[PDB]
């Protein structure tokens, strides 16, 4: 095939041009995101029961729904939380590869057939079934510096004037508002209600009656009396539109003539739908919009579009209203794409340089400058064809491939230049002979390399999804590389290279360049002499090899495995958690106290603190809070001292003594949730009808025994909440019947006033919005207030709650968990230093087996895909290993020569490991993929040395040693150029700091080190492998 | 609150015997309390941890401390069926006829949950069998409204 | 898609069905007409009747089998337990009461009401205590149902 | 309900949740004095109609509960549609023994 | 059918005393063995062909 | 403002993408002749006929 294009250079250009065009179009319409989607499809079912406790939500909503999630396809497991904030969240996780759309609709439908079974008020609130992406494109903060409006005002304005427009912005998928549009608010007064013999029941009734839509009909409506001249609609009663009208609602008429109005027994105001969350941006009331990227959309275009949309609607904001970007991944992504474009560019220059440093002409230096791009462009086109996107992973998959594409370019060219000199052959006939030497090997490298990489596209679970991003990118590039090397480069070489007279090695040339040649032709002789000398007694080296291999294993198992390097995404969190019963005001003090810390003792780095009072990943409540710290740009935070990791340690340290509660700080995961490499996700289960209390005992028991193995287990802890004091009110049925008081009047006067009640809707300036009834704060705070509420009895008398009730304190759960339909408790933890998560799990399994009868367990986090996708690595790489073998066996038509090549694997690994262990890094995804390219390049070098050696013996009849020496001599220059170009090209990644520097350091060191080791070692060891292997058989 | 009190309050909850013992050697205020007035003694009695009840009493615990609603450790113990604890508290001067804000007495709570053995013990230490709550109900009344004749019989 | 389309139309009729049909739950499944298998369950220590066993499989096994991928429908050969109130017309008349009263009483005395919190948001300034209010809760035993006050 | 009302309580509430749908070209809607409303969604020419219906329905679900009780009682259909009639089949009576 | 047994297995350990699973009707076993038999005849075929 | 829908929408799109349609199309013919006739001169000469 190379001969074919050697004679048809134009055709070669055509194929190149097409690849270039497709590639070009590819990067035009190709998706762009920080990360592809790797987590298994998930669907969440959210419901809200205002005023309800955890137990109430669970037993009337959670359980009901859970019991109807039958007949859905590919469900891995289902988990849920029922809490005292009145909400329930059921998460269903589906098998990877499941269509999320089908998954959602199948879930949504089963719900629809369970709705009649749910409490009425839960049915009015609604039940939301949504996809569980969990990744936001950015979040827009909306605050008011004028101090002219509350977060409820900011929210309303946001929902009615910004929400809709953002949703329609090109590329935006979903959008969450941080708060709610107004709600008509009726704040009742029990002292006023009693004064008129009224109850929250009378209130509600009047609202339902006086705030409604009433159908009427038409005048001259069909079927009419003939002769009818007009037909018109009859508009009757419509919904109220203002607080004034609501206050004007007639509640009662006394027989003296007076009129009792609603504004005469309650405060009427436009407020929030819920008050459990108070958000602030640098101490100012705040609101916002969580924005997610739409499928297959370009992240950069979307960020720009939502920006242009915001700018476009700015002229209509209220005084003091301005938006802010606490969270935005776009900048990161932009930086990432930039840094990747540099790396390839400079790598291309570096190749030019060394290519010119070793070679005489420019026509040569030019050839790779064409080949590499063509190969890169084409790779994009192939990814496009596989629906891949430009993201953090795919881009690095390409940088880790540079060496492989640079090598292919340098190899084909260098060999042609080497053939022309060692024999006066002209550019064309010389290119024909050159290819005839490597072309065979070239296909081998391809088959072998794919043997190494495609297997990696077969790991399962979210981890498998990551390996797949690198795998396909690399194999594709590599694949196109051999194609281009077999079609485009030969044509270019037999076309642009100038003749070079037999025996001219530049030794007889001008100044410097002439000196270099002289010295290189010199070092080549030394080098060949060392090998002859080394091949003069191999034993020494067989021994050194074992020392290496042995050192590799030791160095390996001591290297701490991990996921993806943490990063400084200019933002991080700080968790705040207070004691059981801690009020909303108390945690406000702390959050402010945290905010202040950040805006003061860190004024240099912190840009803003978004203090969310009332939320906490492992459980909502008044005693929980979180502050998202948005840092200044990277160019204002130089010095490790001013980085998330550092700032975090200093922050947690400083908060390490706030005596009111635990307030730690922390950087955030590279992707989604735990992912804790050393972490495991346990699930304790009630398999009999044990109950919360007995489950708790079992939990404690398991946790106590866990603390007795700090050698294997570390940080064993429950991911949920602890029980707290509850106010148990008992209604005496006999007494209520005796005084003539109905249980329904009792339960609504109670729950409405103290829990709140969603009555119906009203239109606010054109938008339907809820109407809520609830007691005024001061009358629903303490146990003594209970007695201040009255209920009208049949006989008309008013009776105080204290007449028919009695109470007492007790303990209960403010957050009941559940796994696969049964009561449960989640437990997180990690393997002790040195131990593997696998070992840590195995122990927890042994300790769990010693728990009370009826207590089961199960894994669910990263733990599910590890007890399942347990391990393929060996069974996968054993396959890779075997595959590589057959390929070589075919290339060399020998059942033994392959071993002389395979023996190089450790040569690069040791270097990567050395560099790794030294720089302190860890065994992560980048480090690993890097190990694969390094082995690949070294393997290539060997294949080409063995190919030449075996070649000379068979063709010239040269001896084992003579052939080997001759091959190694010929392969020295090319091999050196590639390593020199690659090591220098990868060098900028190794030193790089800040801004995606974690990933770059990872891909950098493991590669540079393994590269330095693989090269300096292979040129001296493969000759020994070939020779000792050939000696044996 | 107090520094170690918080720790002692949680200890009596989980029943961590050893920590409580260490906490005693350090003076963790046995009179600490959560927001509703539960004392380490209330908790331990509620959750049924006998040893910690015995330790707390050995270290000055108020055997008749009451919560915001007037309930005592004896109320809790009786109500949740911890016979051994019910005996210890009584043995140390727990008020057997103690009445919470509703007029409820340990005897009421025991009867309601049908804890016979505890009721007899309560009767033993002189519990008032005719005690009435805010609704006028006696342990007998509650006894028949529940349909517990064994209990109803002991109450004669 | 078929199941999806059929249910799309079914929710158009749902509102039009009697309250009691809706409350029993109408289902839509996609499965073969014949049985893949039949998992039987017995008691070797003759310590539980066919009623006890059926209730156990329905309360501890069916749900999870019904959620397994590939399982299109699960038929229980027995019935899950329910709180059974067997009325006596003679005694009802004796006390001048009808099943109407009885149904109304179970709805009023076997309730799970949401009653809010103490010191619940939005709170008054200075609030120190926040706790859930637990009022009526579901009944859990025959004894609890037995003592519902009719009149 | 009148046009303006239905558009306020139904049309707009549904429309706002019709975001995040793949291949959506445009959306149009009507709100009548007969209280009837209609929202049509057109997708890119090569879109799979069934998946489009599924996605629409998945979003319409978020809105169902925010609709008037009596609108839910009437049920809301999410169907694949076309604008013109293929044919119109007529029916008449030739022996005059049947009115319209 | 395999998924079902797996689930059934997570349950068995917690069954009440004497409670036991039995398998009265399964159309699965046939399928599996039936196929394995046809495989068997194949090995024989190669041997008889050999 | 305004916009074009339905029928008219297709019409706009139709005419708006016609230029690069003809452009990419000429390019593919040229490149094909080039390759097939291993020449830059031959294809350019024919393409002038368009
Ligand atoms: C379709 C069902 C199964 C078919 C799949 C086949 C998988 C391929 C396995 C072969 C892999 C061998 O890898 C490939 O081996 C072939 C020989 O066949 C080598 O072929 C080369 O070396 C031989 C050996 O001198 C030369 O004579 C020849 O000029 C050249 O083609 C390639 O350089 C190598 O890349
Ligand atoms: C830019 C790259 C060019 C660099 C080339 C120069 C590198 C020189 C460093 C030597 C590396 C290996 O070092 C090589 O060791 C072998 C032994 O194993 C020596 O070999 C010598 O000692 C061995 C005994 O060990 C004898 O069998 C042999 O007859 C003798 O010549 C070589 O003299 C030496 O060159
Ligand atoms: C030059 C010739 C090239 C050779 C090409 C030959 C094809 C290579 C195929 C090797 C198979 C490896 O691919 C492998 O598939 C098997 C089962 O199918 C899966 O194996 C699965 O079960 C194995 C054992 O049954 C378990 O350890 C584990 O549950 C899982 O690995 C592996 O997870 C997957 O990695
Ligand atoms: C000399 C070497 C020969 C190599 C020549 C290569 C020929 C390639 C022919 C591809 C033919 C594609 O025909 C098939 O129709 C689909 C349907 O949309 C087209 O797909 C295209 O149209 C869809 C509309 O559906 C657009 O949204 C989109 O721009 C694109 O995906 C693609 O064209 C392909 O999926
Ligand atoms: C054997 C050779 C292989 C055949 C190669 C096949 C390539 C076919 C290219 C498909 C392009 C179709 O996809 C289409 O992209 C073109 C641009 O090119 C867009 O249409 C427009 O793009 C450009 C913008 O650069 C406009 O100036 C131009 O008027 C028009 O072509 C369409 O909005 C999009 O749908
Ligand atoms: C060139 C040749 C082509 C390749 C052919 C490969 C075929 C390999 C299939 C053999 C694997 C299964 O072997 C098969 O034998 C078993 C017994 O020995 C069968 O088991 C059978 O054993 C008894 C023998 O009659 C029967 O009464 C039982 O009903 C049944 O259990 C299994 O159902 C099956 O496992």
Residue numbers in the entry:
A (entry chain B): 1 to 1033
B (entry chain D): 11 to 166
C (entry chain A): 102 to 252
D (entry chain C): 52 to 151
E (entry chain A): 303 to 352
F (entry chain C): 856 to 905
Authors' description from the paper:
AcrB associates with the outer membrane channel TolC and the periplasmic protein AcrA and allows direct and efficient transport of a wide range of toxic substances. AcrB exists as a homotrimer, with each subunit containing 12 transmembrane (TM) helices and a large periplasmic part formed by two loops between TM helices 1 and 2 and TM helices 7 and 8. The trimer consists of three prominent domains, the TM domain, and parallel to the membrane, the adjacent pore domain and the TolC docking domain.
The crystals diffracted to 2.5-Å resolution and belonged to space group P212121. The crystal structure of the AcrB–DARPin complex shows two DARPin molecules bound basically to two subunits, named A and B, in the homotrimeric transporter, while the third subunit, named C, is not bound. In subunit C, this salt bridge is not formed; instead Lys940 is tilted away, forming new polar contacts to Asn941 and Thr978.
